[PDB]
Ligand binder design. Structure first.
Ligand code: CL
Ligand code: CL
Ligand code: CL
Ligand code: CL
Ligand code: NA
Ligand code: NA
Ligand code: NA
Ligand code: NA
Ligand code: NA
Ligand code: NA
Ligand code: NA
Lengths: 230, 195
């Protein structure tokens, strides 16, 4: 029914520039405000800016004031977030949301504004100061294939920037028992992550286990065979 | 604004109340999905205990296990502010972690740094103490942890602790141990360098 689709997110160097679009399908702007709300990876929701498309009113979070502007092209029923002077903290998924509006409801009754009833799926902004692909090291199996129970094994993917990285096992054949952990920011300023899986000990040495790591910002994919140690 | 319970464990069909310090809205977001509006100012029902605002779920259905965000429109300046967010997790029985320890790979050692990885697999509840020992000296400041979301099927967590050493330090020492403690029990996996 109601559709809101955001586009434009991408990689951008600090002090750079980006512009997002929010296409609307199924309702009328002017009777619905548009809001940009961003979610930093692992964090919660932070309002960015809002706009009343029919009347062109704008309001900005203080952390954004004087850096981003928001606009709407009434012709195509699409709202725009132009972002400038970007700094590392601006990395987020940028949702666009709508909320019922009224000239009077807006001017005198903003505290009692109706909720944001539709949200898009979001568009990702990654500010990067470098592009570094990952190193991938085997976490070699915890058992010796005679151990006779369950073994764990994995891939350490480290020293890459920026996020994200995606991991699969045996090109996606192996998904049961896989755990891919959220990345951590190390003190070098590079992300590191681990992906592990449990398998039957008896299968080690018969079944091959390959993790597949894909770092779209560096256009790099690494395939690592994880072998038993001795 | 501040949301009180921060995290909460509850079971299906339970009375659930998270609070939030004249009008607010509540939003439900599940991982990897977008926020969905719940109610403004159904098993969901709002209230206004004193100055603070309250949301209550009556028969918690399996779809309601998610994170909840308080939200308000500030009249002055036409602002919007959000709550820090409260997460409702599935209670289940306690489940001990399968604990595994991984020496650094030989390839990594060539480069001059040694990562040692400890794994806590498929356990509940979430709180656990993980401690590294190198030749019986407890490590401080050189480790980082990461925890998965609650698995949709068996409702448990997995956790990784990663100890980072220079290759020179790693080759000075012999026993590497990962000790994980939960309540009245501790489990310690270990290895000698070189087997
Ligand atoms: Cl590599
Ligand atoms: Cl063993
Ligand atoms: Cl670190
Ligand atoms: Cl070294
Ligand atoms: Na940066
Ligand atoms: Na074993
Ligand atoms: Na992949
Ligand atoms: Na390969
Ligand atoms: Na290598
Ligand atoms: Na390294
Ligand atoms: Na040490």
């Amino acid at each position: 029914e109601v559709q809101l689709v955001e586009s434009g997110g991408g990689l951008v160097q600090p002090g750079g520039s980006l512009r997002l679009s929010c296409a609307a399908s199924g309702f009328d702007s002017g009777a619905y405000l548009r809001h940009w709300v961003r979610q930093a990876p692992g964090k919660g929701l932070e309002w960015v800016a809002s706009i009343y498309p029919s009347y062109g009113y704008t309001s900005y979070a203080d952390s954004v004031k004087g850096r981003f502007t928001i606009s709407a092209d009434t012709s195509k029923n699409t709202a725009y977030l132009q972002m400038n002077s970007l700094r590392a903290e601006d990395t987020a998924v940028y949702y666009c949301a709508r909320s019922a509006a009224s000239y009077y409801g807006y001017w005198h009754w903003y505290h009692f504004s109706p909720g944001m009833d539709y949200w898009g799926q979001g568009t990702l902004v990654t500010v990067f100061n470098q592009i570094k692909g990952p190193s991938v090291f085997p976490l070699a199996p915890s058992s010796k294939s005679t151990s006779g129970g369950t073994a764990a094994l994995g891939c350490l993917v480290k020293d890459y920037f920026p996020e994200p990285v995606t991991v699969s096992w045996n090109s996606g054949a192996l998904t049961s028992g896989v755990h891919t952990f959220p990345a951590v920011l190390q003190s070098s300023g590079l992300y590191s992550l681990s992906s592990v899986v449990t398998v039957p000990s008896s299968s080690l040495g018969t079944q091959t286990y390959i993790c597949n790591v894909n770092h779209k910002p560096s256009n790099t994919k690494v395939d690592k065979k994880v072998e038993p140690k001795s | 604004m501040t949301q009180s319970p921060s995290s909460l464990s509850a079971s299906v069909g339970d009375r659930v109340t998270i609070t939030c310090r004249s009008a607010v809205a509540w939003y439900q977001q599940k991982p990897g999905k977008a926020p969905k509006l719940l109610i403004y100012s159904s098993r969901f029902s709002g209230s206004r205990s004193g100055t603070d605002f309250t949301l209550t779920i009556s028969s918690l259905q399996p779809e309601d296990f998610a994170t909840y965000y308080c939200q308000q429109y500030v009249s002055g300046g036409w602002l919007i502010t959000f709550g820090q967010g409260t997460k409702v997790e599935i209670k289940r029985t306690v489940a001990a972690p399968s604990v595994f320890i991984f020496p650094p790979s030989d390839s990594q050692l060539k480069s001059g740094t040694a990562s040692v990885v400890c794994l806590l697999n498929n356990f509940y509840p979430r709180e656990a103490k993980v401690s590294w020992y190198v030749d019986n000296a407890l490590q401080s400041g050189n480790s980082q942890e990461s925890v998965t979301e609650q698995d949709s099927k068996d409702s448990t967590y997995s956790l990784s602790s990663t100890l980072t050493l220079s290759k020179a330090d790693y080759e000075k020492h012999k026993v590497y141990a990962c000790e994980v403690t939960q309540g009245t029990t501790s489990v310690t996996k270990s290895f000698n360098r070189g087997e």
